[PDB]
Structure formats: structure tokens, C-alpha cells
Amino acid sequence: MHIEARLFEILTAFFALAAVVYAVLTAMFATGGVEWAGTTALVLTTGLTLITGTFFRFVARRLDTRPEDYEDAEISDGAGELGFFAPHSWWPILISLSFSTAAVGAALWLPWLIAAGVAFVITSVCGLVFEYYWGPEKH
Amino acid sequence: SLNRPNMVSVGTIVWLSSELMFFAGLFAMYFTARAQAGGAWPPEPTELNLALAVPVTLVLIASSFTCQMGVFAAERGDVFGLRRWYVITFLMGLFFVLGQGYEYIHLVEHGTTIPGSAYGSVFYLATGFHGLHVIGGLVAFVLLLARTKMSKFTPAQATAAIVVSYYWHFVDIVWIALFATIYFVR
Amino acid sequence: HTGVDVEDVPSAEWGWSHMPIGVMHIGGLLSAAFLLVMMRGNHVGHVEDWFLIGFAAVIVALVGRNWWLRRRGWIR
Amino acid sequence: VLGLMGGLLQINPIWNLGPYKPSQVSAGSQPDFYMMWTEGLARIWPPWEFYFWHHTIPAPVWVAVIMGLVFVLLPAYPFLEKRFTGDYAHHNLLQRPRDVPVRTAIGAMAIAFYMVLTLAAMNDIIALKFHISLNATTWIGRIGMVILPPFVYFITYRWCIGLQRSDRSVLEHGVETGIIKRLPHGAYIELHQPLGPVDEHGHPIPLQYQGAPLPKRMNK
Amino acid sequence: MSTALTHGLIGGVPLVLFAVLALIFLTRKGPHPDTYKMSDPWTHAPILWAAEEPREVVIGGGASGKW
Amino acid sequence: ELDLPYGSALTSSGRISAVTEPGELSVHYPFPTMDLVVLDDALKYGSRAAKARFAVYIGPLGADTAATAREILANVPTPENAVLLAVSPDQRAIEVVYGADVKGRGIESAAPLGVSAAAASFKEGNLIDGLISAVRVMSAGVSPA
Amino acid sequence: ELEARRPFPERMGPKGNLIYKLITTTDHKLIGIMYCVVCFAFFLVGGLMALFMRTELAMPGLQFLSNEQFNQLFTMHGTVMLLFYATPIVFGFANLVLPLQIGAPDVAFPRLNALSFWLFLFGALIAIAGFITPGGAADFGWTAYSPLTDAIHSPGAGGDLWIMGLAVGGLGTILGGVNMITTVVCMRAPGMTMFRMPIFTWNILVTSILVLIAFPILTAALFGLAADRHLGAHIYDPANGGVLLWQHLFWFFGHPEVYIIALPFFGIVSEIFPVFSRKPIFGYTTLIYATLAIAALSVAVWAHHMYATGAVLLPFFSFMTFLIAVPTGIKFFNWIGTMWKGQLTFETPMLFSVGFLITFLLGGLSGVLLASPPLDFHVTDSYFVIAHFHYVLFGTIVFATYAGIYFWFPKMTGRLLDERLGKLHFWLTFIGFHTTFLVQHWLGDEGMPRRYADYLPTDGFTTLNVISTVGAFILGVSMLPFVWNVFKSWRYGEPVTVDDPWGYGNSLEWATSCPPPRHNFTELPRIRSERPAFELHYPHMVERMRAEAHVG
Ligand code: HEA
Ligand code: HEA
Ligand SMILES: [Cu+2]
Ligand SMILES: [Cu+2]
């Protein structure tokens, strides 16, 4: 995982340089000094790219080449068993409906509807999470 | 085939970056309207109680270490040490939430409200969303503990433990930043 | 049962699975007629008459399309 | 449960009202929820009256007629259905709702009609809390009462048939496990799990439906 | 200016342009081959069509004809 | 091993991966689409009602016509339960072939009816229509068992 | 010897085949089809709003609309067209063809995929359902500026629904971006390195990164605005820097958005050109570097939308936009070099790509003209800006979306769209667009600001509004050929029994069955370059490809 980390590090370098340049050039030459909004936004954009690139570097420096990282690789190299991929599920639409109920209750200021929407969100997220872990009914 | 870098880990890290951008928006809101308030910018009916804000910060910092002990226990596949350390972390997070709420009650009793001033607005909007993120983390702890109770322990369960772990770590670091910005720098 | 195919409805031999098509056709026609009559004694305003005629025309168009395609052999 | 909710929730606080008097009124209406469909019918029915020689037939006669027609059609359904379907046998085993699509769609249509009539009874509360016009709510109920039930019927029919087809797929192949392989020549397979015997080629032998539910998750 | 002119242009120019473009484009010939006439010889490759509907070499009869 | 006509390739499996030029088609049946769809629907709904496959062949029979038709029937998926109709417009010849399982279900009374309908509609020059008429008559004749 | 086929493939499918599958599905192909259909419905709604606006704008005087109604109309038109059609059509195309292009069987998180789709749908419905309020829908601008959106001014309930619907849709978009980044990083064939993957995949990766940068700050700003409107929260109070705080936050979100809806369509035309030129893509690594540079620069120009406020540092942002203008030109030159000296055939996707080229060139020229602060000082907030962003937006999303639909319809359905109807559709669209949006430059050059519901006869600009309305009605009538074509060709229409019905295709999606199976692949070829399907279908060409590649 070298190219991904390198991409994020290039982005981090540019964002950090732009952040510091803007901060200084607004500290001077500007009406009321530092702008305090674009500065914060650029600083934490740099932080975003930095977090991601750092995680990718740290997982890459303790890894050996994968078949997709390796030219001259054959398809027989990737033979095996991939992970688990969820087939059919109806829980996402219920989660969406719960969030929509909460959002309507927040738009029209209705605390009872907000509370009902939050309870529905909790219930449907629990349903989503426990879907492939419930055991058989113990009778 | 096995593509050794974990997938849920990557997804969680990138979503945490997005949440960092959300807090960037909140921080810009706060830093504006401080450059406008002249002189004593925290108004006179506003006095911050440092005898309550440092203990809860220490409790959250200790939560970080208990959660790391939990994930250490998770990586060697025994569920019971995991459950113990995560119950401890849940209790400490609940203590932090209750302390924050009590400080809110005491601050509203004789002073700052959201419609009262601009300082109260930025203060409450910046700290209450962090409180909501802490409550989300607590709910995640509960759900993970129930899932470990309801089936056999596997590497997928260990991965779930790890990703909840560094979500909690992200929340703690964001609190450190907010606390240092609001109480000490002023 | 009066009859559908197990290639259309897998569980056709386990329960009621067929309703005649004339019932649905005349029901759509009667619903259109009711929507049209529902503006008798028009109280002041006409924005709702446009919704009435719109829905009536849509229902009639659906029924007519189904009838035409069943008549020319493109259905069943 | 009844004690908890009779202690913790306030219902019918008659003192906030007063004694009944023929001259006073309030924006309050809406009888208990099991009588709300009659109120909604009275609210959304159009004013059709008849005047002939020194006589009068007002509009609520329609409401009374529809109420009595429902009260008559409810106890007659078993006999109507046996006459229509021509099925006069004895039955001790139940049906799954997905296997009787026409009756399931009839019931869904009736529930949709009931729900429209029940929502039309809270016109004023809905218009006040959710910012909609009162005339708009009245017309919305009046048009929904005729256009929503057949839509629900159509959707329910297709939905039951889709559930049947899902059952048939699970009977033909095995339970889907969610695990993917790569098959060194570059093919992706899904690793089904059979519920019965397999052939010499490994593919499971298809089974017959028997009116019972089929497992869809490997963990169950 | 000249309400009649405005409405006439706005209502009529699109339809005239549509008509002329349709007459230009939809009157051409598609890639679908022409229908085979029985007067001409059968030049296409052999054709075999089946039903596929009934799902899971001893002849049982036959019949012949010469039109 | 074969020609692989300029775009086809044999893959890691036995499947061939062909291509088409950007403007051309990949079917080339010299009949209208609304003729092919009516033939397909007749062919499907006759088979579903008679519980036997129905097949149609239009290529040549430049030999003993019955023998060629019976050799052709071997390429139908389940040839024991199947009814095949072969037509040669070059030789003006019609043949119908049966299967072992489809026998005694009403077939011998239906093959000459189908041949007659096909010939009658070929006498005008309507190949696809004659095929449709013949298949309709034969499938209405046969019975499931 | 012989093979048993059918006279015609099955038209529709059995009864009960779609509704439950639609509620329970977790596969990206069906999810992308749903994306496309719903996005086009929303496109039709927005176009109806635009037609009402044009009809009122002709013929000075208020003939049938009101001021409030016209304001609601342009607000909701902009909102729908930008956030309910383009941003979700991006992820529609992504879900359609990204796993097939990297050689994967699935996306990383298939249930998060469906969650994103349903969140989009319900958020859009919540935001649109403000028209049924007695006050009406939101009637401030699409930008929703600083003090006009409080509760004193604009007190209705439409703006609240607007805010909450935008928040829900933004959450859906964020989840989609996370999914796409993870899918590109983890799931990938055992020979496909990152510099062998297609430019469309590169562009989707970059666009997802931009999404994750841009949308959370919009969510934060919208929650702040809701706090103001529902609790009196002093956050955008002009007694503080509340007027410019909103503009800074909103435009920091909003420019990365207009780049989020451009790069995947650059990638689409980059996939389409080589196939119909029978040549390799010119400057592969150069296009990748240009995409990366555009992405990096796109987050540092936001305040060129704030020149006329007197509160921004003009030279910094002006230089940054002048800078960002260059990689787009590099990309244009690569696209030209791709077609240069080929064997060109002009089917519908190629025709639409060339139309994109022309329209986007003119739009980008007007934009680079717009980037000069002294020129913006006059032409800002006028119809010149409207003409500019309509040229760029139409050229990219409309033309590249049509090109991609015509390109990938066989791959997703197994049928071919008609070509004569497609040519009629293209020429109607071209003539209508250039008739409706060309005279607006002059229209705004002589003083006519945007968002004007009414004007006077003694003013100029009355014939040009008539001409623009004629063009808008042509654009409105241009959709019937396309809708009829899709509706007919889904069920009837020429079947495809081969892979790659457009010969000389690349990118590993033309190396599988035309309607791909579940899990997308029954075998894979050896991956040696960025044209694996080309090297698979033409093996007598690999030598001649490696030999004469660096001539120039
Ligand atoms: C996809 C949409 C899209 C795209 C791609 C662009 C592309 C560009 N835009 Fe535009 N813009 C919008 C959508 C878009 N814009 C929208 C929606 C608004 C207003 C929204 C609202 O207010 O409601 C807007 C407003 C806007 C403004 C403010 C106008 C105003 O409000 O007063 C400015 C000014 O800086 C600007 C500049 C640019 C520049 C420099 C580019 C560059 O990317 C273009 C450069 C590309 C070219 C094609 C150059 C060609 C290159 C070569 C071939 C070499 C040529 C050599 C030279 C001439 C240098 N845009
Ligand atoms: C992708 C974005 C996008 C797209 C595709 C369009 C498409 C069009 N736009 Fe829009 N427009 C914007 C984005 C877009 N616009 C934005 C961001 C603004 C600024 C918003 C602001 O001011 O806040 C704007 C503003 C704007 C104005 C200025 C309004 C005002 O400021 O006063 C005008 C008027 O000339 C206009 C015209 C058009 C026309 C004629 C089309 C044509 O291309 C579309 C015509 C299409 C059709 C007509 C569809 C066909 C309709 C049917 C067939 C009816 C069927 C009905 C149903 C199915 C429901 N647009
Ligand atoms: Cu811009
Ligand atoms: Cu402006």
C-alpha cells in the first residue's frame, strides 16, 4: 500500500503549505487580521489527509506485497477465500425511515417526534448490527 | 485473496476524518465572534468552574487507557477481560456525561443560555455536539458487548472491538482540543 | 382454483391466487366516475378540479392500455 | 403494563374541560380511536342531499348507510369467499399470508381504507402541527379515500408473489452463506449450503415446498 | 411586443424544428436486415429455435409434406 | 484450435469472448421483431400447456429429409419429450418429428394438421406466419401426461 | 453443429420479480439502476420549474406568477438540479461500473450502499415537500445567504424542511464516498496495480476524497442555522462577523461541490474517446496528475465567489483560480491527441462527447474571464454568470451523462438503444441549448441582474428573453425522443450476445458477459496494461502496442 499513502501525503503537503501561507498573508495585509474561518478549515483539511496517510503508511510498513500491488502477478496468486459479503437485507430502508422521522421532527419543532425518531433509529441500528449474530430460538 | 489490510479498519479511519471536518466547522464558528468581542470577551455573568472541568477530563483520559486494555485483551481471544475493561470504560464515560450535564445545569442557573449571548451560543453548540458523540460511543459500547454475548468469539468480533476502540480515542482527542481551546487559552 | 399457472404464481395450489380482469377494469372505470362526480356542486375554487381530472384521466389511460394490450395479444 | 401506563400517562382530563352546555364549543373533536373512522367519513363525505315533495334526505344518511354496510359485510366474508372460490372442504392447517395473494391484497386494501378514514378524523390537529392547510387536508383525504386502496392492493399482490419466488430460490439452491471464493481461473462463487442431499456433482437436489418457512440466514 | 408574435414563435418554432429533424433522421434505414422472401434462395445459416419452458434419442414417430 | 473470427478469444474457461463492430448487430435473423416475438410467445405458451418442448428448424435437408430431421432432433435439450418442425424452403419440404415420451398424448392426430396449416400458409409466401399457425395447431392438439 | 436459441429474448420478466428484490437488494448493479431512474425523475421536475420560470420571464410584466412564487421557483430549481440529480448520478455511475473495472465481485459495504441510496431518496423527498405548506417552499437563494435565512425574515416552514433534507442527503453522500474509497483500496484483481486502473476509477477515488472534505462542513453550517432558527442562537448575527462567516463556510463547501460533479464525467469521456478512435488514451499518467492537481487546488479558491463584498484577499484567490485553469487545458490537449490520427466513427456516445468538448470549452473560457476581479466587479450577479455556469454544467453533466448512458446501456441490460432516435435527440439538445443560453452573455452585459422576476418595457433586453424562451422550449421538447427510446429499447430492441458490442473496448468490463452475472465474473484475463480487454480480444496487437507507443 505505497501509492495510496503517497497520494494522501502529496495532498497533505499541499494543504499544509496553503494553510500556512493563507494564515500569514491574512495576519498581514488583511482588514481585521487573521480570517479565522478559512484558516481553521484548511488546517483541519490538512489534518484529515494527515490521519489517512499516516494510517496507510503504518499499515504499509508492516506488510508484504499483495498480488494487486505486484506486477508480473498471475490470477492463480489470488485464489482462495475472500471475506463475508452481505446478501439481501431490509434493515437499511428502516434505518432511513427512522432518520427521516427524526429529521422531520427536527424541522417542525416537535420534541415527541424527535424522541420517537431517536428510539426508532436505535432499534433499527440494533437490528442491522445483530442480523448475522442472533442464534436459534432457545425454546 | 486474504488482502491482509483490514477493511472495516480503513472504513472507520476515513469516516473519522470526515467527522474531523465536521468539528472544523464548529471550531470556525467558535473562533469567529471571539475576534469581535472586545476586551473581556467572556461576558461578566460568565465564570468557568475549573474545579469540575479538570476531573472529568482526567476521567476521559483514563477511559482511553481502559479501552486500550480492552483491545489488548481482545487481540488474545478471550471475551471476559474484554467485557470487564469495556464495562469500566462505559462507567467512566457515563461519569463524564453526568459531570458535563451538572456543569450545564449550574451554568444555566445563574447565567449563560443559548439565546442569552453569543458566547453562550458558541459554547453550547461546540460542547453539546461533543456530548452527543460521547453518547453515541456509549451506545456503540453497549451494542458490541451484547454482540459478544450472543455468539462465539471470532476475528470479526475482534475487529469490531478495535474499531470501536479508536472511535473512542478520536472522541477523547477532540475533547482534549476543545478543553484546551476554551478553558486555558480563552 | 379457476386457474393460474405455477410459472406465474408458484404457490397457486395453496390459496386463492386469481381475480378476474373485468372486475379490475370496471372498478377503475367506477373510480374515475366517482372522482369526476366528486366536483358536483362546486364550491368556490378550481385548483382541486385539476387534480380530479388529472387522476381520472390517468386511471382511464391505465385501464385502456391494459385492455388494448390484452386484446392484441401482447399480454397473456 | 396497564398499571404502568395508567399511572404514568394522563388520559381524558375532564376538569380542563367544563360541564356540557349547548352554547359553548372548542376546537376539540375526535372520539376515541375506534370510532374515528365514522368521524372521518362524516368529515370528508361530500354534501349530496335530495329534496322532493315536502321531504328531505340530508347528507349524514350516507355515513349511516356506509356504516351499516360495513357492519353487514364483516360477518359475511367466510360465506362470500367460499361461494367465490368454490372451496367447501374442512381445514385444520393454517395458510401463510404470502400463499394467498388475493386475500392478502384485499385485507391490505381494507386496512388502507381504514387508515385513511382514521387520519381524516384528525384534520385539524394534523393541519396545526404539520403546517398544512385545512382545505388541503380535507381534499387530500377525499382523494386518497378512492385512489390509495387499489394502489396498496396492486403492491401487496406483487409483494406476496416476490416472497414466494424468494422461497422457491432457497428451495432450489441452498442457503446463501455470504462467503466468496476466487477459483484460480478467476471465477467468483458464493458457497451455498444445502438443506438436503446433493448429487454426485455436488450441487444440491431441489426440494418441494410444503407450506413451512425456510431459513434465510446461516446463523439461525 | 406583438403578443401574437411572441406566442406564435415560442409555440411553433420547436414543433417545426422537431418535424424537420424527424423527417431527416427517422426516415433512414436501420441495421435490421430485410425480410426474406420465399422466392429467393435460403442464404442464411441454419436456424434452430426451442421453447426453454419445460425445465428439469428414441424417436416416436414423424410426418412429412411437400407444401 | 478453431478460427476465432477476429475478436473472439478462448478464456481460462471454455467460454468464448467475442466482439462486434460498433455499428453492426449480433443476431441477423431475416424476420421482423414483431414476428419473432409472436413466434416466441406461441412457442412458449404452447409448450407450457402441452408439457413438451416445441422446436423449429429452417436450414436445409439436402438428403433423406426424414433422416436429416431425426438427426437434427438430437440437438434439442430433452429430445425424448419434444416435437420438432423442420422446413426447407429450397426443397419446399416439411417434416415433423416426435419423441419417445411424447407419444399417445394426442400427437398422431396433430402432426398432419400442423403440416397442412404450414403448407397452406406457405402457399402465399409467409414463412414465419406458417410456422406460427402450425405450432399453434399442434400445441392445441397435444395433451399433457 | 447446431445450437438451440430463442426467436427473441424474454421481454419483461415474471410477475413479482422486482418489488421485493428492490426492497431487499444489496447488489451494486441494481442499486445503480435505481440511482439513474430516480435522478432522471428529479431532472424532469427541475426542468418543469425552469420552463415555468422562462415562460414568466418572456413578455415584460407579471402575467401568471407572483414574486414569491418566482423566488420559490428558482430556489427549488437550483436545489433540485444540483443536489438531487448530479451528486447522486455520480454514485449511480460509480455503482454501475467501478467494481467491474477493478475486477471485484462486490463493493466493500453492500448494506451501507443501500443505506446511502435510501437516505438520498428520503432526504430529497423531505426537502421537496415544502410546496404543500401554506407559506410555500424555500424562497431565498440556493446559496441561502446570511441574514435573509433567519426567523425574522423568511419565517415559513419550507426552509426548515430544506435544511433537514439537505442534512439527510449529505449523510448519504458521505457514506457513499467512504464506501467507494474503501472499495478501490481493498477489493482489486490480483494483477491490477494502481497505475493500470482506468481513469474513471481514478476520478471516482479523487471525487470521494473531495466529498469527504466538503460535505461535513456543510452539515455543521446547516445545524448552526437550524439552531439559530429554532433557539435564537446568535451564531450568524451581523453584530458579530456572522454575515461573512456563513459565506466563507458555504463557499468552502460549494466550490468543491462543482468540482465533485465534473471529474467523474471527465473520466467518462476519457473512457469513451479511445474506443471510437481505435487508439490508446493519450497521456495516461499526465491525465492522472492533472486530476490530482485539480483536486488539490479546488479547496483553495473558494472566495472567488466573494469578490464584490470588499472583505476577501483578492490577489491570493485570483492567482489560485488562474492556476487551476491550467490542468483543465492539459486535459483538453490530451483528449485532442487521443482522437488525433485515428479511425473516427461517430455513434451516439462519440457525438455526445464531441458536443461536451465544444460546450465545455466555451464555458471554461467564460469562466477564466470571470476569474478577474475587475471584470467580475461588473459582470457579477448578472446573466453572464448564469450563462457561464450553465455552459459548464450542461456540457459536463448532461452531455457526459447521455454519452455514458448510451455507452453502458448494453452492458447493464443486454439490449441496444436505437441510433436514429439518439441522433435526433442529440441534435435537438444541441440546437436548444445554444439557442437558450448564448444571448444571456449580452443580456447580462447590459444591466440585467439574476433572480429578477420582472422588468420594464423601457429597459432593453426584451427580444433576447423571447429568444431564450424559444430555446428553453426546444430543450424541453428534446426529452421525448430519449424517454421513448429508453422505454422501447428496454423491452424490445436489438439483443447483444457478445461481449463488447462497441468493438475495440478496454477496462476489463468488456471482458465479461454483456449482462454480467451475479459476482460479475466467471474468469479473468492476464492484466499487463490498462487495456486488458483489448489485449485479450486482439492478441496479434500486443507487440505493435508495446513497440510504437512512445513515438509521439
Ligand atoms: C461543473 C461546474 C463548474 C465548472 C467546471 C466551473 C469552472 C470554473 N469556474 Fe465556475 N461556477 C459554477 C460552476 C462551475 N464552474 C457555478 C454553479 C457558479 C455560481 C453558482 C451560484 O452562484 O449560484 C460558478 C461561479 C464562478 C465564479 C464567480 C462568478 C460570480 O458569482 O460572480 C468564478 C469567478 O472566479 C468562476 C470561475 C471558474 C473557473 C476559473 C473555472 C475553471 O475550472 C475553468 C477553466 C477551464 C477551461 C476550459 C480553460 C480552458 C483551457 C485551455 C484550453 C487553455 C486556455 C487558455 C487560457 C484562456 C488561459 N465560477
Ligand atoms: C445541473 C444544474 C442545472 C440544470 C441541468 C439546469 C437546467 C436549465 N436551467 Fe437552470 N439553474 C441552475 C442549475 C441548472 N439548471 C442553478 C444552480 C441556478 C441558479 C439558482 C439560483 O439562482 O439560486 C439556475 C438558474 C436558472 C435561471 C435563472 C433563474 C433566475 O435567476 O432568475 C434560468 C432562466 O433562464 C435557468 C434555465 C434553465 C433551462 C432552460 C434549463 C434546461 O436545461 C432544462 C429544461 C429541461 C426540461 C424542460 C425538462 C423537461 C420537462 C418536462 C418534459 C416536464 C415533465 C414534467 C414532469 C415529468 C414532472 N436556470
Ligand atoms: Cu466557483
Ligand atoms: Cu453575490
Residue numbers in the entry:
A (entry chain H): 1 to 139
B (entry chain G): 18 to 203
C (entry chain D): 25 to 100
D (entry chain N): 276 to 495
E (entry chain I): 1 to 56, 69 to 79
F (entry chain J): 13 to 157
G (entry chain F): 10 to 561
The authors write:
In OXPHOS, the protein complexes of the electron transport chain (ETC) establish a proton motive force (PMF) across a biomembrane that drives the synthesis of adenosine triphosphate (ATP) by ATP synthase. M. tuberculosis cytochrome bcc forms a dimeric assembly with endogenous menaquinone/menaquinol bound at the quinone/quinol-binding pockets.
We confirmed this complex to be active with a turnover number of 23.3 ± 2.4 e-s–1 (mean ± SD, n = 4), in agreement with the previous study that shows M. tuberculosis CIII can functionally complement native M. smegmatis CIII and maintain the growth of M. smegmatis. The structure of this hybrid supercomplex was determined by cryo-EM to an overall resolution of 2.68 Å, allowing that the components to be clearly assigned in the density map. The hybrid supercomplex including the M. tuberculosis CIII dimer forms a pseudo twofold symmetrical compact rod, but with a slight curvature in the membrane plane, as previously observed in the M. smegmatis CIII2CIV2 supercomplex. The hybrid supercomplex is structurally similar to the supercomplex isolated from M. smegmatis, except that subunits LpqE and Unk (probably MSMEG_0987) were not observed here. In the present structure, two canonical quinone-binding sites are identified: (i) the quinol oxidation site (QP site) and (ii) the quinone reduction site (QN site). One MK molecule was identified at this site with its naphthoquinone ring surrounded by hydrophobic residues, QcrBPhe158, QcrBTyr161, QcrBLeu180, QcrBIle183, QcrBMet310, and QcrBMet342. The edge-to-edge distance from MK to heme bL is 15 Å, exceeding the 14 Å limit for efficient physiological electron transfer. Thus, we speculate that what is observed here is the oxidized product as it leaves the QP site. In addition, the QN site is formed largely by QcrBTMH1, QcrBTMH4, QcrBTMH5 and one loop region of QcrB.
